[PDB]
Amino acid sequence: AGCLIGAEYVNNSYECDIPIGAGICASYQTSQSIIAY
Amino acid sequence: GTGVLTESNKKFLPFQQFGRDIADTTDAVRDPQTLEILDITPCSFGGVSV
Amino acid sequence: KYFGGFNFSQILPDPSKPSKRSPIEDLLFNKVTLADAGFIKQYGDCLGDI
Ligand SMILES: *[C@@H]1O[C@H](CO)[C@@H](O)[C@H](O)[C@H]1NC(C)=O
Q1: How far is CA B14 from CA B24, B31, C49, in A?
Q2: Which residues precede gaps in chain A, with C-N > 2.5 A?
Q3: B8-12: which pairs have CB atoms within 8 A and are 24 or more residues apart?
C-alpha cells in the first residue's frame, strides 16, 4: 500500500482492527508500541 | 512548468517544437540552446495517512 | 481424496502451482484482463517512454 513509518513488523498473526491494506494491518500491542502484521 | 527533466529517447519531427500526451499538457520539449529533446514529469507525491 | 467416487480435483486447490488456486480459478483469473490494482510505482517506472 505504501511506506509506513513508526510500526514494527511482527511475524505473528492476529485478527486485526486497523486495516492498512493488502493484508497488512496495524494494531497497538506490547514497552508498548504499534505493530504491523 | 515544474517537474523533473530527463533525456527522452524519442525523436521529434523537425518543424514542430514540443510534444503532448492525452491531456493538453506538455510531456516533452526541445531545449533552445543545444536542441535536446527532454522528458517532463511532475515530482513524486501521494496522500499521507495516520 | 476418495470422496465415494466423485472427482473434485478441478475445484480443490492445486499445490503444485505457486498460487494455490484450482485450475478453474486459474482459467477464470487469466480470462479477466484486469488493470493495475495498487502497485508501488516508485515513480521510476512512471518516468520513461513506456
Ligand atoms: C480426476 O480428475 C483428474 C483431473 O481431470 C484426472 O486427472 C483424474 O484421472 C481423475 N480421477 C478419477 C477419480 O477419475
Answers
A1: 20, 13, 19
A2: 30
A3: B8/B37, B8/B38, B8/B39, B8/C49, B9/C49, B10/B37, B10/C49, B11/B37, B12/B37
C46/B8 Cβ within 8 A: no
Q: Does C40 touch chain B (CB under 8 A)?
A: no
User: Mutating which of C39, C40, C41, C42 best tests the A interface, going by the most A Cβ atoms within 10 A?
Assistant: C40
Sequence-distant (6+) residues with CB within 8 A of C14 are: C20, C21, C22, C23, C26
Residues of C in contact with B4 (CB under 8 A): 47
Q: Using an 8 Å Cβ cutoff, are B43 and B18 in contact?
A: no
Resolution (Å) of this entry: 3.0
The residue whose grid cell reads 500526451 is B21
C49 residue type, one letter: D
Residues of C with Cβ-Cβ distance to B39 under 8 angstroms: 47-49
